[PDB]
Amino acid sequence: GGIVVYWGQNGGEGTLTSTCESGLYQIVNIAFLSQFGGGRRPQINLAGHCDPANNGCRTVSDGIRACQRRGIKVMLSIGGGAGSYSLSSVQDARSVADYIWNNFLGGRSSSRPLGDAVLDGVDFDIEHGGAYYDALARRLSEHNRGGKKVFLSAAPQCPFPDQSLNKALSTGLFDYVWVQFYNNPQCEFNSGNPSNFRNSWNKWTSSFNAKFYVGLPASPEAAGSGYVPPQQLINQVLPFVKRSPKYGGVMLWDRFNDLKTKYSSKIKPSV
């Protein structure tokens, strides 16, 4: 399996290029298109990396390209925990999907926030609402016979169902789902009591036809709870999750914390 990582939300985590050159990752989610929908001006936020004001993040395309030249998928992650975003209608959702297509994917725009690189897909990290993200996914998906060629991923929290992502996920259009098994004590892995996690993984994987990733914090500093020491992950979680044919690997929040702990490097041989 593969390791998925988020990059973009910590200006101290190094470049996207470096992230991809590390060889640690199969997919990088650029976090985030933090503002969109509802008539909002779409905005990316890449923390201290670059100021998206008048597309000051255009150089990210170098990283995107560096990644793609190494066979690494680079997803635009939309939403996140800080931005102001929500969808007002199906038309709005389609409008946002079209905006994303034109500005980040295979469409055309004179003001592409991350430059001319064509991202591989869109990662739905939707933390409030839920309404119309199905329409958004469907509109993006329309390019999977039109295109090219748009992967869809979602980052639901582990408590099932995820109220923000359930509608989107119900479309069955998502290629990848990294379920966040942290900051959610009811479904986090605990060595002494692994059933909560195992039941959660089972339920998620059973509920959607996607490739599933175990979404985890890359450091204990990256989550209030749910961190799994890499050896526990390797010894206790992976033999179980690997039994799922839908098992895709492990997703890590985030590049910064992963760099700190070398978590991915420790689990890479085992994922």
Side-chain angles (χ1 to χ4, degrees), residues 101-130:
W101 169 251
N102 286 321
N103 282 272
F104 299 91
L105 307 172
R108 289 277 209 183
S109 181
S110 70
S111 56
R112 294 171 71 92
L114 306 173
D116 284 340
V118 174
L119 294 177
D120 295 291
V122 180
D123 172 65
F124 284 51
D125 183 4
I126 302 310
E127 302 201 333
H128 39 262

PDB file of all heavy atoms in Angstrom, residues 101-130:
ATOM      1  N   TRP A 101     -12.056  22.754 -11.541  1.00  0.00           N
ATOM      2  CA  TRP A 101     -11.640  22.202 -12.820  1.00  0.00           C
ATOM      3  C   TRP A 101     -10.768  23.208 -13.570  1.00  0.00           C
ATOM      4  O   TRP A 101      -9.665  22.887 -14.031  1.00  0.00           O
ATOM      5  CB  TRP A 101     -12.870  21.833 -13.636  1.00  0.00           C
ATOM      6  CG  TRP A 101     -12.542  21.515 -15.048  1.00  0.00           C
ATOM      7  CD1 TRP A 101     -12.831  22.267 -16.145  1.00  0.00           C
ATOM      8  CD2 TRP A 101     -11.836  20.370 -15.518  1.00  0.00           C
ATOM      9  NE1 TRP A 101     -12.357  21.655 -17.278  1.00  0.00           N
ATOM     10  CE2 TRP A 101     -11.740  20.486 -16.923  1.00  0.00           C
ATOM     11  CE3 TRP A 101     -11.282  19.248 -14.892  1.00  0.00           C
ATOM     12  CZ2 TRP A 101     -11.113  19.522 -17.713  1.00  0.00           C
ATOM     13  CZ3 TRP A 101     -10.665  18.297 -15.668  1.00  0.00           C
ATOM     14  CH2 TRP A 101     -10.585  18.436 -17.074  1.00  0.00           C
ATOM     15  N   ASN A 102     -11.246  24.447 -13.656  1.00  0.00           N
ATOM     16  CA  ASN A 102     -10.547  25.465 -14.441  1.00  0.00           C
ATOM     17  C   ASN A 102      -9.270  25.994 -13.829  1.00  0.00           C
ATOM     18  O   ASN A 102      -8.348  26.433 -14.534  1.00  0.00           O
ATOM     19  CB  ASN A 102     -11.484  26.619 -14.739  1.00  0.00           C
ATOM     20  CG  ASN A 102     -12.493  26.253 -15.783  1.00  0.00           C
ATOM     21  OD1 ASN A 102     -12.161  25.559 -16.751  1.00  0.00           O
ATOM     22  ND2 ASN A 102     -13.739  26.686 -15.595  1.00  0.00           N
ATOM     23  N   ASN A 103      -9.224  25.954 -12.505  1.00  0.00           N
ATOM     24  CA  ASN A 103      -8.172  26.621 -11.798  1.00  0.00           C
ATOM     25  C   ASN A 103      -7.115  25.690 -11.257  1.00  0.00           C
ATOM     26  O   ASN A 103      -5.994  26.119 -10.970  1.00  0.00           O
ATOM     27  CB  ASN A 103      -8.753  27.526 -10.727  1.00  0.00           C
ATOM     28  CG  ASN A 103      -9.284  28.793 -11.328  1.00  0.00           C
ATOM     29  OD1 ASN A 103      -8.535  29.742 -11.477  1.00  0.00           O
ATOM     30  ND2 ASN A 103     -10.542  28.775 -11.787  1.00  0.00           N
ATOM     31  N   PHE A 104      -7.473  24.416 -11.150  1.00  0.00           N
ATOM     32  CA  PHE A 104      -6.571  23.442 -10.544  1.00  0.00           C
ATOM     33  C   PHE A 104      -6.429  22.173 -11.339  1.00  0.00           C
ATOM     34  O   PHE A 104      -5.414  21.503 -11.215  1.00  0.00           O
ATOM     35  CB  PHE A 104      -7.045  23.091  -9.127  1.00  0.00           C
ATOM     36  CG  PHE A 104      -7.078  24.255  -8.214  1.00  0.00           C
ATOM     37  CD1 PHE A 104      -8.236  25.027  -8.090  1.00  0.00           C
ATOM     38  CD2 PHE A 104      -5.955  24.588  -7.466  1.00  0.00           C
ATOM     39  CE1 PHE A 104      -8.270  26.125  -7.263  1.00  0.00           C
ATOM     40  CE2 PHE A 104      -5.983  25.688  -6.604  1.00  0.00           C
ATOM     41  CZ  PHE A 104      -7.153  26.449  -6.494  1.00  0.00           C
ATOM     42  N   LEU A 105      -7.439  21.851 -12.141  1.00  0.00           N
ATOM     43  CA  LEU A 105      -7.444  20.610 -12.895  1.00  0.00           C
ATOM     44  C   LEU A 105      -7.226  20.911 -14.385  1.00  0.00           C
ATOM     45  O   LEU A 105      -6.449  21.795 -14.724  1.00  0.00           O
ATOM     46  CB  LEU A 105      -8.737  19.829 -12.644  1.00  0.00           C
ATOM     47  CG  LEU A 105      -9.059  19.578 -11.164  1.00  0.00           C
ATOM     48  CD1 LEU A 105     -10.428  18.977 -10.993  1.00  0.00           C
ATOM     49  CD2 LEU A 105      -7.991  18.666 -10.532  1.00  0.00           C
ATOM     50  N   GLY A 106      -7.905  20.173 -15.252  1.00  0.00           N
ATOM     51  CA  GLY A 106      -7.599  20.217 -16.675  1.00  0.00           C
ATOM     52  C   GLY A 106      -8.241  21.354 -17.437  1.00  0.00           C
ATOM     53  O   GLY A 106      -8.082  21.440 -18.647  1.00  0.00           O
ATOM     54  N   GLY A 107      -8.958  22.232 -16.741  1.00  0.00           N
ATOM     55  CA  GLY A 107      -9.609  23.363 -17.385  1.00  0.00           C
ATOM     56  C   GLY A 107      -8.693  24.541 -17.597  1.00  0.00           C
ATOM     57  O   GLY A 107      -7.468  24.427 -17.478  1.00  0.00           O
ATOM     58  N   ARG A 108      -9.281  25.688 -17.915  1.00  0.00           N
ATOM     59  CA  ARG A 108      -8.497  26.855 -18.280  1.00  0.00           C
ATOM     60  C   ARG A 108      -8.854  28.011 -17.374  1.00  0.00           C
ATOM     61  O   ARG A 108     -10.025  28.253 -17.081  1.00  0.00           O
ATOM     62  CB  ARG A 108      -8.724  27.251 -19.755  1.00  0.00           C
ATOM     63  CG  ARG A 108      -8.129  26.296 -20.806  1.00  0.00           C
ATOM     64  CD  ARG A 108      -6.634  26.567 -21.076  1.00  0.00           C
ATOM     65  NE  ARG A 108      -6.238  26.197 -22.441  1.00  0.00           N
ATOM     66  CZ  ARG A 108      -4.993  26.269 -22.929  1.00  0.00           C
ATOM     67  NH1 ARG A 108      -3.981  26.696 -22.174  1.00  0.00           N
ATOM     68  NH2 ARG A 108      -4.753  25.908 -24.184  1.00  0.00           N
ATOM     69  N   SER A 109      -7.819  28.707 -16.931  1.00  0.00           N
ATOM     70  CA  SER A 109      -7.948  29.912 -16.148  1.00  0.00           C
ATOM     71  C   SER A 109      -6.681  30.742 -16.261  1.00  0.00           C
ATOM     72  O   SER A 109      -5.569  30.207 -16.270  1.00  0.00           O
ATOM     73  CB  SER A 109      -8.200  29.584 -14.683  1.00  0.00           C
ATOM     74  OG  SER A 109      -8.347  30.773 -13.939  1.00  0.00           O
ATOM     75  N   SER A 110      -6.857  32.053 -16.324  1.00  0.00           N
ATOM     76  CA  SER A 110      -5.728  32.976 -16.372  1.00  0.00           C
ATOM     77  C   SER A 110      -5.193  33.302 -14.973  1.00  0.00           C
ATOM     78  O   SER A 110      -4.216  34.034 -14.839  1.00  0.00           O
ATOM     79  CB  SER A 110      -6.144  34.268 -17.080  1.00  0.00           C
ATOM     80  OG  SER A 110      -7.050  35.001 -16.278  1.00  0.00           O
ATOM     81  N   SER A 111      -5.840  32.772 -13.938  1.00  0.00           N
ATOM     82  CA  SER A 111      -5.439  33.054 -12.563  1.00  0.00           C
ATOM     83  C   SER A 111      -5.444  31.779 -11.720  1.00  0.00           C
ATOM     84  O   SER A 111      -6.056  31.733 -10.651  1.00  0.00           O
ATOM     85  CB  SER A 111      -6.383  34.087 -11.944  1.00  0.00           C
ATOM     86  OG  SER A 111      -7.722  33.624 -12.028  1.00  0.00           O
ATOM     87  N   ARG A 112      -4.761  30.749 -12.206  1.00  0.00           N
ATOM     88  CA  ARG A 112      -4.651  29.494 -11.462  1.00  0.00           C
ATOM     89  C   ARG A 112      -3.781  29.698 -10.225  1.00  0.00           C
ATOM     90  O   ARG A 112      -2.588  29.997 -10.347  1.00  0.00           O
ATOM     91  CB  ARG A 112      -4.067  28.402 -12.345  1.00  0.00           C
ATOM     92  CG  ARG A 112      -4.953  28.000 -13.497  1.00  0.00           C
ATOM     93  CD  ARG A 112      -4.210  27.085 -14.427  1.00  0.00           C
ATOM     94  NE  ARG A 112      -3.990  25.755 -13.840  1.00  0.00           N
ATOM     95  CZ  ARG A 112      -4.810  24.722 -13.992  1.00  0.00           C
ATOM     96  NH1 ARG A 112      -5.925  24.852 -14.689  1.00  0.00           N
ATOM     97  NH2 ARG A 112      -4.517  23.539 -13.442  1.00  0.00           N
ATOM     98  N   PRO A 113      -4.380  29.548  -9.022  1.00  0.00           N
ATOM     99  CA  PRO A 113      -3.692  29.856  -7.764  1.00  0.00           C
ATOM    100  C   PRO A 113      -2.389  29.090  -7.552  1.00  0.00           C
ATOM    101  O   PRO A 113      -1.469  29.608  -6.922  1.00  0.00           O
ATOM    102  CB  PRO A 113      -4.733  29.495  -6.698  1.00  0.00           C
ATOM    103  CG  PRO A 113      -6.043  29.643  -7.406  1.00  0.00           C
ATOM    104  CD  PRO A 113      -5.774  29.131  -8.784  1.00  0.00           C
ATOM    105  N   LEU A 114      -2.307  27.869  -8.058  1.00  0.00           N
ATOM    106  CA  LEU A 114      -1.082  27.096  -7.856  1.00  0.00           C
ATOM    107  C   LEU A 114      -0.268  26.965  -9.132  1.00  0.00           C
ATOM    108  O   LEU A 114       0.669  26.170  -9.192  1.00  0.00           O
ATOM    109  CB  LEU A 114      -1.400  25.720  -7.272  1.00  0.00           C
ATOM    110  CG  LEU A 114      -2.234  25.762  -6.003  1.00  0.00           C
ATOM    111  CD1 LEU A 114      -2.634  24.334  -5.601  1.00  0.00           C
ATOM    112  CD2 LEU A 114      -1.502  26.486  -4.881  1.00  0.00           C
ATOM    113  N   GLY A 115      -0.627  27.759 -10.139  1.00  0.00           N
ATOM    114  CA  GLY A 115       0.066  27.720 -11.423  1.00  0.00           C
ATOM    115  C   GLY A 115      -0.532  26.753 -12.420  1.00  0.00           C
ATOM    116  O   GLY A 115      -1.649  26.255 -12.247  1.00  0.00           O
ATOM    117  N   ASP A 116       0.217  26.477 -13.482  1.00  0.00           N
ATOM    118  CA  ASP A 116      -0.323  25.741 -14.610  1.00  0.00           C
ATOM    119  C   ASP A 116      -0.322  24.224 -14.497  1.00  0.00           C
ATOM    120  O   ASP A 116      -0.918  23.542 -15.328  1.00  0.00           O
ATOM    121  CB  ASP A 116       0.363  26.182 -15.903  1.00  0.00           C
ATOM    122  CG  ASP A 116      -0.129  27.535 -16.382  1.00  0.00           C
ATOM    123  OD1 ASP A 116      -1.230  27.971 -15.965  1.00  0.00           O
ATOM    124  OD2 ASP A 116       0.585  28.156 -17.186  1.00  0.00           O
ATOM    125  N   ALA A 117       0.324  23.700 -13.461  1.00  0.00           N
ATOM    126  CA  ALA A 117       0.284  22.278 -13.197  1.00  0.00           C
ATOM    127  C   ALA A 117      -1.166  21.837 -13.047  1.00  0.00           C
ATOM    128  O   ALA A 117      -2.024  22.586 -12.545  1.00  0.00           O
ATOM    129  CB  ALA A 117       1.099  21.934 -11.952  1.00  0.00           C
ATOM    130  N   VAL A 118      -1.440  20.633 -13.519  1.00  0.00           N
ATOM    131  CA  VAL A 118      -2.766  20.093 -13.464  1.00  0.00           C
ATOM    132  C   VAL A 118      -2.794  19.070 -12.353  1.00  0.00           C
ATOM    133  O   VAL A 118      -2.173  18.013 -12.467  1.00  0.00           O
ATOM    134  CB  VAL A 118      -3.153  19.464 -14.800  1.00  0.00           C
ATOM    135  CG1 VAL A 118      -4.494  18.766 -14.709  1.00  0.00           C
ATOM    136  CG2 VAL A 118      -3.182  20.566 -15.877  1.00  0.00           C
ATOM    137  N   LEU A 119      -3.502  19.408 -11.272  1.00  0.00           N
ATOM    138  CA  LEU A 119      -3.659  18.461 -10.168  1.00  0.00           C
ATOM    139  C   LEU A 119      -4.419  17.216 -10.590  1.00  0.00           C
ATOM    140  O   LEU A 119      -5.192  17.213 -11.560  1.00  0.00           O
ATOM    141  CB  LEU A 119      -4.316  19.117  -8.934  1.00  0.00           C
ATOM    142  CG  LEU A 119      -3.462  20.197  -8.267  1.00  0.00           C
ATOM    143  CD1 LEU A 119      -4.221  20.815  -7.135  1.00  0.00           C
ATOM    144  CD2 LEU A 119      -2.160  19.621  -7.715  1.00  0.00           C
ATOM    145  N   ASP A 120      -4.209  16.154  -9.830  1.00  0.00           N
ATOM    146  CA  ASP A 120      -4.743  14.841 -10.179  1.00  0.00           C
ATOM    147  C   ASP A 120      -6.137  14.616  -9.675  1.00  0.00           C
ATOM    148  O   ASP A 120      -6.824  13.683 -10.094  1.00  0.00           O
ATOM    149  CB  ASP A 120      -3.814  13.778  -9.638  1.00  0.00           C
ATOM    150  CG  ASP A 120      -2.481  13.830 -10.312  1.00  0.00           C
ATOM    151  OD1 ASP A 120      -2.454  13.485 -11.503  1.00  0.00           O
ATOM    152  OD2 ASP A 120      -1.505  14.278  -9.693  1.00  0.00           O
ATOM    153  N   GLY A 121      -6.545  15.452  -8.738  1.00  0.00           N
ATOM    154  CA  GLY A 121      -7.853  15.279  -8.194  1.00  0.00           C
ATOM    155  C   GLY A 121      -8.114  16.213  -7.060  1.00  0.00           C
ATOM    156  O   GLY A 121      -7.382  17.179  -6.820  1.00  0.00           O
ATOM    157  N   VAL A 122      -9.220  15.918  -6.405  1.00  0.00           N
ATOM    158  CA  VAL A 122      -9.731  16.779  -5.377  1.00  0.00           C
ATOM    159  C   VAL A 122     -10.019  15.949  -4.153  1.00  0.00           C
ATOM    160  O   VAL A 122     -10.668  14.911  -4.223  1.00  0.00           O
ATOM    161  CB  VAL A 122     -11.006  17.496  -5.857  1.00  0.00           C
ATOM    162  CG1 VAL A 122     -11.549  18.437  -4.746  1.00  0.00           C
ATOM    163  CG2 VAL A 122     -10.717  18.291  -7.138  1.00  0.00           C
ATOM    164  N   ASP A 123      -9.512  16.430  -3.028  1.00  0.00           N
ATOM    165  CA  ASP A 123      -9.667  15.745  -1.767  1.00  0.00           C
ATOM    166  C   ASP A 123     -10.683  16.548  -0.969  1.00  0.00           C
ATOM    167  O   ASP A 123     -10.530  17.771  -0.774  1.00  0.00           O
ATOM    168  CB  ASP A 123      -8.319  15.696  -1.035  1.00  0.00           C
ATOM    169  CG  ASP A 123      -8.459  15.169   0.382  1.00  0.00           C
ATOM    170  OD1 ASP A 123      -8.829  13.973   0.523  1.00  0.00           O
ATOM    171  OD2 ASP A 123      -8.260  15.967   1.342  1.00  0.00           O
ATOM    172  N   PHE A 124     -11.737  15.876  -0.530  1.00  0.00           N
ATOM    173  CA  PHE A 124     -12.800  16.577   0.176  1.00  0.00           C
ATOM    174  C   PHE A 124     -12.554  16.490   1.664  1.00  0.00           C
ATOM    175  O   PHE A 124     -12.816  15.452   2.289  1.00  0.00           O
ATOM    176  CB  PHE A 124     -14.151  15.955  -0.112  1.00  0.00           C
ATOM    177  CG  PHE A 124     -14.718  16.291  -1.448  1.00  0.00           C
ATOM    178  CD1 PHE A 124     -13.985  16.132  -2.633  1.00  0.00           C
ATOM    179  CD2 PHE A 124     -16.033  16.718  -1.526  1.00  0.00           C
ATOM    180  CE1 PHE A 124     -14.553  16.409  -3.866  1.00  0.00           C
ATOM    181  CE2 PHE A 124     -16.618  17.004  -2.762  1.00  0.00           C
ATOM    182  CZ  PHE A 124     -15.883  16.845  -3.933  1.00  0.00           C
ATOM    183  N   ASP A 125     -12.059  17.576   2.230  1.00  0.00           N
ATOM    184  CA  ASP A 125     -11.819  17.595   3.659  1.00  0.00           C
ATOM    185  C   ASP A 125     -12.829  18.550   4.269  1.00  0.00           C
ATOM    186  O   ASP A 125     -12.491  19.638   4.731  1.00  0.00           O
ATOM    187  CB  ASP A 125     -10.382  17.995   3.979  1.00  0.00           C
ATOM    188  CG  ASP A 125     -10.099  17.941   5.468  1.00  0.00           C
ATOM    189  OD1 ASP A 125     -11.010  17.517   6.218  1.00  0.00           O
ATOM    190  OD2 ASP A 125      -8.989  18.319   5.872  1.00  0.00           O
ATOM    191  N   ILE A 126     -14.079  18.122   4.234  1.00  0.00           N
ATOM    192  CA  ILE A 126     -15.209  19.009   4.485  1.00  0.00           C
ATOM    193  C   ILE A 126     -15.582  18.806   5.926  1.00  0.00           C
ATOM    194  O   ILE A 126     -15.891  17.688   6.343  1.00  0.00           O
ATOM    195  CB  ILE A 126     -16.392  18.680   3.572  1.00  0.00           C
ATOM    196  CG1 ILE A 126     -15.993  18.780   2.089  1.00  0.00           C
ATOM    197  CG2 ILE A 126     -17.609  19.585   3.883  1.00  0.00           C
ATOM    198  CD1 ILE A 126     -15.289  20.081   1.719  1.00  0.00           C
ATOM    199  N   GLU A 127     -15.543  19.879   6.697  1.00  0.00           N
ATOM    200  CA  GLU A 127     -15.677  19.708   8.128  1.00  0.00           C
ATOM    201  C   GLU A 127     -16.956  20.331   8.682  1.00  0.00           C
ATOM    202  O   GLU A 127     -17.252  20.241   9.866  1.00  0.00           O
ATOM    203  CB  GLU A 127     -14.374  20.123   8.824  1.00  0.00           C
ATOM    204  CG  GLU A 127     -13.196  19.271   8.275  1.00  0.00           C
ATOM    205  CD  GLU A 127     -11.991  19.200   9.190  1.00  0.00           C
ATOM    206  OE1 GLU A 127     -11.821  20.167   9.970  1.00  0.00           O
ATOM    207  OE2 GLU A 127     -11.214  18.194   9.102  1.00  0.00           O
ATOM    208  N   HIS A 128     -17.750  20.914   7.803  1.00  0.00           N
ATOM    209  CA  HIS A 128     -19.065  21.394   8.212  1.00  0.00           C
ATOM    210  C   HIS A 128     -19.959  21.415   6.998  1.00  0.00           C
ATOM    211  O   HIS A 128     -19.475  21.346   5.849  1.00  0.00           O
ATOM    212  CB  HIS A 128     -18.977  22.779   8.862  1.00  0.00           C
ATOM    213  CG  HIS A 128     -17.993  23.695   8.205  1.00  0.00           C
ATOM    214  ND1 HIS A 128     -16.713  23.876   8.685  1.00  0.00           N
ATOM    215  CD2 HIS A 128     -18.101  24.485   7.109  1.00  0.00           C
ATOM    216  CE1 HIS A 128     -16.074  24.734   7.911  1.00  0.00           C
ATOM    217  NE2 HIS A 128     -16.893  25.119   6.948  1.00  0.00           N
ATOM    218  N   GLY A 129     -21.255  21.529   7.241  1.00  0.00           N
ATOM    219  CA  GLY A 129     -22.230  21.368   6.188  1.00  0.00           C
ATOM    220  C   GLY A 129     -22.263  19.931   5.698  1.00  0.00           C
ATOM    221  O   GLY A 129     -22.362  18.983   6.487  1.00  0.00           O
ATOM    222  N   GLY A 130     -22.155  19.763   4.396  1.00  0.00           N
ATOM    223  CA  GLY A 130     -22.347  18.459   3.787  1.00  0.00           C
ATOM    224  C   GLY A 130     -23.249  18.605   2.584  1.00  0.00           C
ATOM    225  O   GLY A 130     -23.075  17.909   1.594  1.00  0.00           O
TER     226      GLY A 130
END
